[PDB]
Write a protein that binds this ligand. Sequence first.
Ligand SMILES: *[C@@H]1O[C@H](CO)[C@@H](O[C@@H]2O[C@H](CO)[C@@H](O)[C@H](O)[C@H]2NC(C)=O)[C@H](O)[C@H]1NC(C)=O
Ligand SMILES: CC(C)CCC[C@@H](C)[C@H]1CC[C@H]2[C@@H]3CC=C4C[C@@H](O)CC[C@]4(C)[C@H]3CC[C@]12C
Lengths: 388, 390, 517, 40, 33
Amino acid sequence: MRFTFPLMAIVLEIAMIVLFGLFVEYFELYPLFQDVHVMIFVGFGFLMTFLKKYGFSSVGINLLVAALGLQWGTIVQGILQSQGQKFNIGIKNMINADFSAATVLISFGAVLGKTSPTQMLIMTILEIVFFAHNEYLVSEIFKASDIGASMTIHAFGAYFGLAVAGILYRSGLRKGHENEESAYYSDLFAMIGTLFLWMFWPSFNSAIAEPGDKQCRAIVNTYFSLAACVLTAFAFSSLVEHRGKLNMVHIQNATLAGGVAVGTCADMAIHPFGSMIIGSIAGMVSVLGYKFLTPLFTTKLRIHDTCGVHNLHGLPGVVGGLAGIVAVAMGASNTSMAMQAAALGSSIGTAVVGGLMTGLILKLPLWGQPSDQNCYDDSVYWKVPKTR
Amino acid sequence: MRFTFPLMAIVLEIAMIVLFGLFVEYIFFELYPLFQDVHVMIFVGFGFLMTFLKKYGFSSVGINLLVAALGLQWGTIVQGILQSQGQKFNIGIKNMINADFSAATVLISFGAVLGKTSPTQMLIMTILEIVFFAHNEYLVSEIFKASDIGASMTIHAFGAYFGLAVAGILYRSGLRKGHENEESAYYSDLFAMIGTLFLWMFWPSFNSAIAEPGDKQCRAIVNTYFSLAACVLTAFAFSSLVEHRGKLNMVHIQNATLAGGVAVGTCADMAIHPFGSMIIGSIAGMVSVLGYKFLTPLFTTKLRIHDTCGVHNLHGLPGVVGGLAGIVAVAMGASNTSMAMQAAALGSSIGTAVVGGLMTGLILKLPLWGQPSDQNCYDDSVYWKVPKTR
Amino acid sequence: PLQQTGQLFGGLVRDIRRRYPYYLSDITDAFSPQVLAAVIFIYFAALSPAITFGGLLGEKTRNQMGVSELLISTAVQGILFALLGAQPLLVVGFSGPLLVFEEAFFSFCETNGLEYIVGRVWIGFWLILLVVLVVAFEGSFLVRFISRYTQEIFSFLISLIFIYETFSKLIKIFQDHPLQKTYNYNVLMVPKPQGPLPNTALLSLVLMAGTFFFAMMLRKFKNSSYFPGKLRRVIGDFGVPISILIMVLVDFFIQDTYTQKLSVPDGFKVSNSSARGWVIHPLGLRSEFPIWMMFASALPALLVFILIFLESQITTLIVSKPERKMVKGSGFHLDLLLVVGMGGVAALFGMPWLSATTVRSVTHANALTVMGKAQIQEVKEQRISGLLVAVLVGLSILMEPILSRIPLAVLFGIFLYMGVTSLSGIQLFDRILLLFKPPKYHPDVPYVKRVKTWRMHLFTGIQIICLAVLWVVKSTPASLALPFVLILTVPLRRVLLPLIFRNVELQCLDADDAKAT
Amino acid sequence: GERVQLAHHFSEPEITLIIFGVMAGVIGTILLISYGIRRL
Amino acid sequence: APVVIILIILCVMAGIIGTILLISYSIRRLIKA
Ligand SMILES: *[C@@H]1O[C@H](CO)[C@@H](O[C@@H]2O[C@H](CO)[C@@H](O)[C@H](O)[C@H]2NC(C)=O)[C@H](O)[C@H]1NC(C)=O
Ligand SMILES: CC(C)CCC[C@@H](C)[C@H]1CC[C@H]2[C@@H]3CC=C4C[C@@H](O)CC[C@]4(C)[C@H]3CC[C@]12C
């Protein structure tokens, strides 16, 4: 049925309107919110536009998924905070809504090109619930320090997408696809999203930090972590390719691993040299992952990651969680170390379980999945112009 | 003849310099964050949103930049003169946010006559339309004392119907059936998505810049945020509904997703509740998609009014919906001020837009400004040195 | 459509297979101003009977079922029927025979000391059993034995009842405020005037006359030769809304004179909160419900089933004649099942069961009827009109400030227009007019040119005797036997009439497709 | 409900489910009897 | 309790979508044959 997507979108919008009527009531953090907003809707949106025949779907489904996600995440996170009571909408609620949208977009990066918009709406709805429950658990039960959300956002979304793609495994696409190839101007467009993410990541890691020392420490640590990560990503991208060539996938993605891996330790007093070391290790790990672990996952473990979001969010997210554990062990934080370990493990496990359940739901042949031949093609769901 | 464009531009710039010397003399570091976002909206979102044409990207973005740059100098002059009543006035942050709102109105009007006008015609249209817009908005804000903080009436509807009037006067019989250059390309649509996303993200600052600090500004931000959120979902749903085989159309995603922000402008600062803002956004998105599907062909083929960007379906119809929503919100006790003044503001905005657009199009229709032929419409090569390679 | 398949639920699926393929057309066909004018017409045409019958039911049952319950039931059943029925042009709502049954059942419960609403719940429970069996065995195949004879008799009788009640309301208005030389200027107005008031009945008569006159004038202007054709037809489709607006403004500009207005409930609440709630326990609210009444409710359930079945099926026959250009199909089995099931469900909620009323459905079909350049061209067969009517009836409570300024006299003129326009599709009415015409002026139709004049006049006179008897039945306390007396004409047509009429005369005079035998 | 009502062993959902089950059983019995008839 | 409310909302949305899809599939299978 071709009417599944508009019907589902209208029903979801009506449900959001009813929930905002039932549960929702009525400024120095606004520029940081705008920076996070620009990240969510431009950086992730254009970062996935590297495919030559899937730019329309990537950017449009990014916008649609994040627009549904901010409302649904607002409702779910507010309900979890207020124990089922009404709550006021401030700037922090909008920031956390954009964070939930970020998690859903990170998951969407894994199954890009092999899913329908209807599947994306369903995955958004389920993933927001799972992510918000995990985030509430980490923030209020374990009370870990994850101000940059290496474990609760990046690792969670990465492993959620990995589980969804593992359930949604296609045997015909395991050896590659003719449409799964980048273009010149498509990579040029992806650099826009890469640059915007890199420029505004300190606000991502310092939006909801405690005002004062912690916020400044988060800003400075994120900035220097990214500065080191860029150089190390370039170096290792040259190292792992033939004749020292630079691979555009590495420059587009791995340059952002420093922000992910410094997220847990952002507000800690790890010093700029420590942040630079973390960013360097993150860039090295991301490049090594893209070079070697992604084909290993695709061919042997039967888990296809379209954008390689594992190498950008999961491995740097786990690195950031372990860095938080070490930094607590070194006295850089007054949190519990066992709580940081529990937060990392619980984030990974909840992501895997929720991804398995959501992928099992999405495998039902009702949502208009593309055929194996038509994967990574805009013409399945969009009116594509005749010329490029 | 050949020097008309630079000569007119230098004369206008010298006039602006003289007027600034005559009338203009020199909280700010608080609203500056929001000004930066409006400037990014005015100079990037509108600039690239209209670059969807496959052979008109250069003229789109460059004439957008030129028009907005001259507008921020002319709108400052005219609005400061109107507020100060002919006396010298000092320029602060609010003075340069209103000058970017006048530029926004002129760019909305540009969206209607895109691809069929010369840069000289755009200079003339900017100069006249800023005067008409400033007088209408002074009337609405001070005589009628209507609440139009997001300017669904003074900016969006005004610019949309101004551009419709200008396109009606500048009607070309050869372009009624269509043109070979009036179609999109893949990467041109990606640039249009760049512009769309920037407008969509920075619209809350656009609506809440002039709002009273405190509760009203926060209400404006929240209402715009959730109205746009609802508008995206409904625009996607109805774009899938109205198109053939359920295929999404990029024009709908590029334009109709901003209709929620357009329509919530009048009710931005009011206590219309987030559910009310989401309802307004959903209705605006549905109306915009339906307009793009049905009414624009009716406007082009039957009413002899061609709308290149479909700025009617994005700014006028959602703008009129926003005016009606403001009237209803005043009725439902959501704010102060009378219903009659909101209705008078909407009517005066539409009427002044139509009359000023008629006069401006009559001045533009003169065979003096080097307007292109019917063959060369939507082609960059008429005014720009286009590279051989794409 | 009336054939017996022999398969269990065969007629149900056949009706499902007939109309549901046209579902996308049922939404797209409604994007026209004529559908909107039909919605505006049928909104009043279904709300005013709903309000009046809810008031009467609350008065006669001590507000155990009232205006709000009737409005809610009407909205729910109309939405479900427009979204699922195979004849969406039918209008679902309360009717007179249902009110008579409610009065009789309330009297029976009061005499025997039984709980009226719990007995209603049990009767509605018994209704679901009856209609499932009838649809399963294709009990709707017996409708094929109702010819144009019974259909036209029932339609003419129902139109006469509607017009007579419309005039009797005006008679009641005149009697309540008679024309007197002097009046008491100090009369209490809440809840109703306690004495005669000056200028009330005469202004109501003026409003009713103006409404009917302007409705007829704009209907004639639809078929006239004035103005451009598009604007002329747009105005003609909106003749009823324009007449209503003109007369409402006329009454609004007169402030001193009192006129009775529409009254709606204050909010979505039960009429009597001290008696029952929204959900009624089938085991009893105040006292334990007797076991014997659970089984004894079958006979009243049978009577209600007969009433609803005959009413809805004859209405479906009338609104879906081949001569009315209904080229999308109708579902006899599905719609009957849906109507009786929704009635049984609404009985569980303390709400009245509903059936397809003839007058409102025929007006709704005629509102969407497109006349060619005379000759019926097509019908805007779509589901949006009935759904919108149901939604507006449900929302009538929330729009009290608008409905409180509409006089009943304008609605009376609208009812008169509906009654006089409901007689168009009846050949019995046409033959009645031929009783006062010279034989040479009679039209060139098969039933006149092939049958002798006195034979046709005798055939018409026999039907009038049946009409007069049915009028006697209505004006007697045994008015619940009316469907049986109407059924008794089926033996009259198929047994007694052939003894005095030839086969050719019967074929010409009673033709399903108006053919010359 | 409303005001004071007598308390029964079965609640309203329970009693309506029991009644619906009895009705479904009766309908199934009638359908099976009809299926048996017109075959032998 | 917030978890109960969120699960209830998910159950309502899933039930609505499932019922609509079930009705559509039943109508399709009755209509095609
Ligand atoms: C609501 O219902 C109650 C009880 O069902 C009605 O109260 C009865 O009123 C009649 C009329 O005088 C008398 O039998 C008694 O006064 C009451 N009987 C009982 C058993 O309470 C009440 O009148 C109803 N309300 C309305 C507005 O009709
Ligand atoms: C035709 C429809 C209404 C079903 C047929 C009704 C008969 C056969 C059934 C349906 C529900 C049944 C009742 C259900 C529950 C009870 C409570 C118990 O303590 C005594 C018997 C009693 C009171 C039953 C009597 C018989 C009953 C009334």
